[PDB]
Protein backbone atom coordinates (compact mmCIF):
# COMPACT_ATOMS: atom_id res chain seq x y z
CA UNK A 1 0.00 0.00 0.00
CA UNK A 2 3.02 2.33 -0.18
CA UNK A 3 2.18 2.91 -3.86
CA UNK A 4 -1.39 3.81 -2.91
CA UNK A 5 -0.17 6.11 -0.12
CA UNK A 6 2.06 8.03 -2.55
CA UNK A 7 -0.85 8.10 -5.01
CA UNK A 8 -3.03 9.63 -2.28
CA UNK A 9 -0.33 12.22 -1.55
CA UNK A 10 -0.08 13.21 -5.21
CA UNK A 11 -3.89 13.26 -5.36
CA UNK A 12 -4.24 15.69 -2.44
CA UNK A 13 -1.50 17.94 -3.84
CA UNK A 14 -3.30 17.87 -7.20
CA UNK A 15 -6.57 18.73 -5.43
CA UNK A 16 -5.00 21.78 -3.79
CA UNK A 17 -3.35 22.87 -7.04
CA UNK A 18 -6.60 22.38 -8.97
CA UNK A 19 -8.53 24.47 -6.45
CA UNK A 20 -5.91 27.19 -6.95
CA UNK A 21 -6.37 26.79 -10.71
CA UNK A 22 -10.15 27.03 -10.26
CA UNK A 23 -9.71 30.31 -8.37
CA UNK A 24 -7.45 31.52 -11.18
CA UNK A 25 -10.00 30.54 -13.84
CA UNK A 26 -12.77 32.34 -11.95
CA UNK A 27 -10.43 35.33 -11.54
CA UNK A 28 -9.94 35.69 -15.27
CA UNK A 29 -13.00 34.09 -16.91
CA UNK A 30 -15.83 32.64 -14.76
CA UNK A 31 -17.14 30.44 -17.58
CA UNK A 32 -14.43 27.81 -18.19
CA UNK A 33 -14.69 26.40 -14.65
CA UNK A 34 -17.06 23.61 -15.73
CA UNK A 35 -14.36 21.15 -16.77
CA UNK A 36 -12.23 22.22 -13.79
CA UNK A 37 -15.08 21.27 -11.44
CA UNK A 38 -15.17 17.94 -13.29
CA UNK A 39 -11.43 17.58 -12.65
CA UNK A 40 -11.97 18.28 -8.95
CA UNK A 41 -14.77 15.69 -8.98
CA UNK A 42 -12.46 13.08 -10.52
CA UNK A 43 -9.76 13.86 -7.95
CA UNK A 44 -12.25 13.58 -5.08
CA UNK A 45 -13.75 10.29 -6.25
CA UNK A 46 -10.28 8.83 -6.83
CA UNK A 47 -9.26 9.90 -3.31
CA UNK A 48 -12.40 8.41 -1.77
CA UNK A 49 -12.08 5.17 -3.74
CA UNK A 50 -8.43 4.95 -2.68
CA UNK A 51 -9.54 5.30 0.94
CA UNK A 52 -12.20 2.62 0.49
CA UNK A 53 -9.59 0.40 -1.18
CA UNK A 54 -7.42 0.93 1.91
CA UNK A 55 -10.45 0.18 4.11
CA UNK A 56 -10.09 -3.67 4.11
Amino acid sequence: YQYKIQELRKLLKSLLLNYLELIGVLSINPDMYERKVENIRTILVNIHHLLNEYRP
Partner: protein, 157 residues
Amino acid sequence: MNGNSTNNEQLQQELATTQDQVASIIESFVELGVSIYDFPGTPEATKGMITNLQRNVDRLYKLNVRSNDPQSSLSKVDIPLEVVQYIEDGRNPDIYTREFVEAIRRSNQYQRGKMHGLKQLRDSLADKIVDEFPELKEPVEDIIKRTSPIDNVSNTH
Protein backbone atom coordinates in the same frame (compact mmCIF):
# COMPACT_ATOMS: atom_id res chain seq x y z
CA MET B 1 -19.98 52.88 -39.89
CA ASN B 2 -20.94 55.23 -42.73
CA GLY B 3 -24.28 53.45 -43.11
CA ASN B 4 -24.82 53.63 -39.35
CA SER B 5 -23.94 57.34 -39.36
CA THR B 6 -26.34 58.22 -42.17
CA ASN B 7 -28.99 56.00 -40.54
CA ASN B 8 -28.59 57.98 -37.31
CA GLU B 9 -28.75 61.29 -39.20
CA GLN B 10 -31.88 60.28 -41.13
CA LEU B 11 -33.31 58.97 -37.85
CA GLN B 12 -32.66 62.35 -36.21
CA GLN B 13 -34.45 64.12 -39.06
CA GLU B 14 -37.36 61.68 -38.74
CA LEU B 15 -37.51 62.26 -34.98
CA ALA B 16 -37.51 66.03 -35.52
CA THR B 17 -40.33 65.94 -38.06
CA THR B 18 -42.40 63.57 -35.90
CA GLN B 19 -41.85 65.93 -32.97
CA ASP B 20 -42.99 69.00 -34.89
CA GLN B 21 -46.04 67.16 -36.26
CA VAL B 22 -46.93 66.05 -32.72
CA ALA B 23 -46.46 69.63 -31.52
CA SER B 24 -48.81 70.85 -34.26
CA ILE B 25 -51.39 68.24 -33.19
CA ILE B 26 -51.12 69.32 -29.55
CA GLU B 27 -51.47 72.98 -30.53
CA SER B 28 -54.54 72.10 -32.61
CA PHE B 29 -55.96 70.19 -29.63
CA VAL B 30 -55.55 73.15 -27.28
CA GLU B 31 -57.03 75.40 -29.98
CA LEU B 32 -60.14 73.28 -30.41
CA GLY B 33 -60.36 72.78 -26.64
CA VAL B 34 -60.43 76.51 -25.97
CA SER B 35 -62.81 76.80 -28.93
CA ILE B 36 -65.13 74.36 -27.16
CA TYR B 37 -64.74 76.18 -23.83
CA ASP B 38 -65.15 79.60 -25.52
CA PHE B 39 -67.88 78.41 -27.90
CA PRO B 40 -69.89 81.29 -29.44
CA GLY B 41 -72.58 78.84 -30.57
CA THR B 42 -72.32 79.99 -34.19
CA PRO B 43 -72.28 77.64 -37.20
CA GLU B 44 -68.96 79.27 -38.12
CA ALA B 45 -67.43 77.99 -34.87
CA THR B 46 -68.92 74.58 -35.65
CA LYS B 47 -67.17 74.62 -39.03
CA GLY B 48 -64.00 75.89 -37.34
CA MET B 49 -63.82 72.98 -34.91
CA ILE B 50 -64.69 70.64 -37.79
CA THR B 51 -61.69 72.15 -39.59
CA ASN B 52 -59.51 71.67 -36.49
CA LEU B 53 -60.51 68.00 -36.47
CA GLN B 54 -59.75 67.83 -40.20
CA ARG B 55 -56.18 69.08 -39.78
CA ASN B 56 -55.72 66.73 -36.82
CA VAL B 57 -56.91 63.77 -38.92
CA ASP B 58 -54.67 64.61 -41.88
CA ARG B 59 -51.70 65.07 -39.53
CA LEU B 60 -52.54 61.59 -38.23
CA TYR B 61 -52.54 60.46 -41.88
CA LYS B 62 -49.08 61.94 -42.46
CA LEU B 63 -47.53 60.43 -39.34
CA ASN B 64 -49.19 57.06 -39.83
CA VAL B 65 -47.96 56.75 -43.43
CA ARG B 66 -44.50 57.72 -42.14
CA SER B 67 -44.87 54.94 -39.56
CA ASN B 68 -45.26 52.40 -42.40
CA ASP B 69 -43.24 53.73 -45.35
CA PRO B 70 -40.20 51.65 -46.44
CA GLN B 71 -37.83 54.57 -45.81
CA SER B 72 -38.36 54.55 -42.06
CA SER B 73 -35.87 54.20 -39.22
CA LEU B 74 -38.75 54.32 -36.73
CA SER B 75 -38.96 50.54 -37.08
CA LYS B 76 -35.26 50.47 -36.16
CA VAL B 77 -35.94 52.36 -32.91
CA ASP B 78 -35.88 50.01 -29.91
CA ILE B 79 -38.40 50.96 -27.21
CA PRO B 80 -39.08 48.93 -24.03
CA LEU B 81 -42.26 48.98 -21.98
CA GLU B 82 -40.48 50.43 -18.95
CA VAL B 83 -39.79 53.81 -20.57
CA VAL B 84 -43.35 54.25 -21.85
CA GLN B 85 -44.94 53.17 -18.57
CA TYR B 86 -42.28 55.31 -16.89
CA ILE B 87 -43.58 58.37 -18.74
CA GLU B 88 -47.19 57.47 -17.86
CA ASP B 89 -46.19 57.87 -14.20
CA GLY B 90 -45.46 61.52 -14.98
CA ARG B 91 -41.82 61.11 -13.96
CA ASN B 92 -38.86 62.16 -16.02
CA PRO B 93 -37.70 59.68 -18.70
CA ASP B 94 -34.05 60.77 -18.74
CA ILE B 95 -33.86 59.42 -15.18
CA TYR B 96 -34.53 56.02 -16.77
CA THR B 97 -31.37 56.46 -18.85
CA ARG B 98 -29.56 57.91 -15.82
CA GLU B 99 -30.62 55.14 -13.43
CA PHE B 100 -30.14 52.57 -16.18
CA VAL B 101 -26.52 53.49 -16.95
CA GLU B 102 -25.94 53.82 -13.20
CA ALA B 103 -27.12 50.22 -12.87
CA ILE B 104 -24.66 49.32 -15.64
CA ARG B 105 -21.81 51.04 -13.80
CA ARG B 106 -22.88 49.64 -10.41
CA SER B 107 -22.89 46.09 -11.75
CA ASN B 108 -19.56 46.69 -13.50
CA GLN B 109 -17.97 47.93 -10.28
CA TYR B 110 -19.47 45.05 -8.28
CA GLN B 111 -17.97 42.63 -10.79
CA ARG B 112 -14.62 44.45 -10.74
CA GLY B 113 -14.53 44.32 -6.94
CA LYS B 114 -15.31 40.60 -7.07
CA MET B 115 -12.59 40.28 -9.73
CA HIS B 116 -9.95 41.94 -7.55
CA GLY B 117 -11.09 39.98 -4.49
CA LEU B 118 -10.67 36.71 -6.37
CA LYS B 119 -7.21 37.88 -7.43
CA GLN B 120 -6.32 38.65 -3.79
CA LEU B 121 -7.55 35.23 -2.68
CA ARG B 122 -5.59 33.57 -5.50
CA ASP B 123 -2.22 35.19 -4.89
CA SER B 124 -2.50 35.04 -1.09
CA LEU B 125 -3.24 31.32 -1.46
CA ALA B 126 -0.29 30.95 -3.85
CA ASP B 127 2.22 32.72 -1.59
CA LYS B 128 1.01 30.76 1.43
CA ILE B 129 1.24 27.44 -0.44
CA VAL B 130 4.77 28.11 -1.66
CA ASP B 131 5.67 29.11 1.90
CA GLU B 132 4.35 25.82 3.28
CA PHE B 133 5.25 23.63 0.28
CA PRO B 134 8.59 24.41 -1.39
CA GLU B 135 8.29 21.33 -3.61
CA LEU B 136 5.09 22.74 -5.15
CA LYS B 137 6.45 26.20 -6.02
CA GLU B 138 7.00 25.40 -9.71
CA PRO B 139 3.43 24.11 -10.35
CA VAL B 140 2.04 27.07 -8.37
CA GLU B 141 4.01 29.58 -10.46
CA ASP B 142 2.99 27.70 -13.61
CA ILE B 143 -0.65 27.97 -12.54
CA ILE B 144 -0.15 31.68 -11.79
CA LYS B 145 1.30 32.45 -15.21
CA ARG B 146 -1.36 30.28 -16.85
CA THR B 147 -4.21 31.86 -14.88
CA SER B 148 -2.81 35.38 -15.35
CA PRO B 149 -2.31 35.53 -19.13
CA ILE B 150 -1.03 38.51 -21.07
CA ASP B 151 -3.63 41.27 -21.28
CA ASN B 152 -5.01 41.87 -24.77
CA VAL B 153 -8.59 42.77 -23.76
CA SER B 154 -7.58 44.57 -20.54
CA ASN B 155 -5.01 47.15 -21.71
CA THR B 156 -7.86 49.21 -23.16
CA HIS B 157 -10.01 50.89 -20.52
